[PDB]
Amino acid sequence: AITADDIAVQYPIPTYRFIVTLGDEQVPFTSASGLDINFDTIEYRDGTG
Amino acid sequence: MSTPAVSHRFLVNFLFNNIPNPFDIAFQRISGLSRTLEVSQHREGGENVRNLWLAEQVNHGSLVLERGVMNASPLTLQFDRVLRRESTQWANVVIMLLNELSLPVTTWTLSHALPVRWQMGDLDAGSNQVLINTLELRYQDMRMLGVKL
């Protein structure tokens, strides 16, 4: 007994159903990848540790 | 044989006469202390096969220091006074390496060091780096101590 209104809140989301709005229109695509958020890194060491 | 000394742990102590407390400041990149004796070559008349080196005058190097732009210490406030020509105070500097425990294995002990140059790092829009400023001192004498001479 899980009553699929609970699946819409608790279970994860699959990748195969997606829409891509590109500007003022929707275009049907097959794949979509590369939407990362990547940072650089700054360091500093001194002689005391 | 005992293990040689690595070069990534070091303390620096300063003692000015303006400032009543001796302060200890962490640096990144102490450059290195040289000490040259400045010989001169003489050429004799009948001697063509040997050389003759005559000792003159000991030349000491310079203490170049690097650290990041951090909060105002008693040493960057002191270079600001000397480079604005409000004082000409100089300090006795003690530099020492540390072994695995805490112990000073070598000590360099500079005398009458005078702040002579400030050098700021680059401001660049794509850089990903800490702003490092370069400090430089000219001292009068140098006396190395410690057990690892």
Shape of chain A: flat
**H/I helix tally of chain A:** 1
Classify the beta-strand content of chain A into a percent band.
5-15%
Largest sheet of chain B: 9 strands, antiparallel
Indicate the percent of residues in helices of chain A: under 10%
Shape field of chain B: globular
Strand and helix order of chain A: HEE
- The termini of chain B sit apart by 15 Å
Compute the number of strand runs of chain B.
13
> What is the helical fraction of chain B, as a range of percent?
under 10%
Number of helical regions of chain B: 1
Oligomeric state as shown = part of a larger assembly
| CA-based gyration radius of chain A | 21 Å
Q: How many structural domains can be distinguished in the coordinates of chain B? A: 1
Q: In order across it, which strands form the biggest sheet of chain A?
A: 1-2
Please summarize the sheet with the most strands of chain A.
2 strands, antiparallel
Tell me what portion of residues of chain B adopts beta-strand conformation.
Answer: 35-45%
Structural class of chain A: little secondary structure
Task: Spell out the helices and strands of chain B N to C.
Answer: EEEEEEEHEEEEEE
Structural class of chain B: mainly beta
What does this structure look like?
Chain A is low in regular secondary structure and 49 residues long. Helix content of chain A is 8%, strand content 8%. Chain A has one helix and two strands. Chain A has a two-stranded antiparallel ribbon with strand order 1-2. The longest helix of chain A has 4 residues, at 7-10. Chain B has one domain (1-149). Helices cover 5% and strands 36% of the residues of chain B. In chain B, strands 1, 2, 7, 8, 9, 10, 11, 12 and 13 form a nine-stranded antiparallel β-sheet that branches. Chain B has a two-stranded antiparallel ribbon with strand order 3-6. The radius of gyration of chain B is 20 Å and the shape is globular. The relative contact order of chain B is 0.23. At the A-B interface, loops of A face β1 of B.
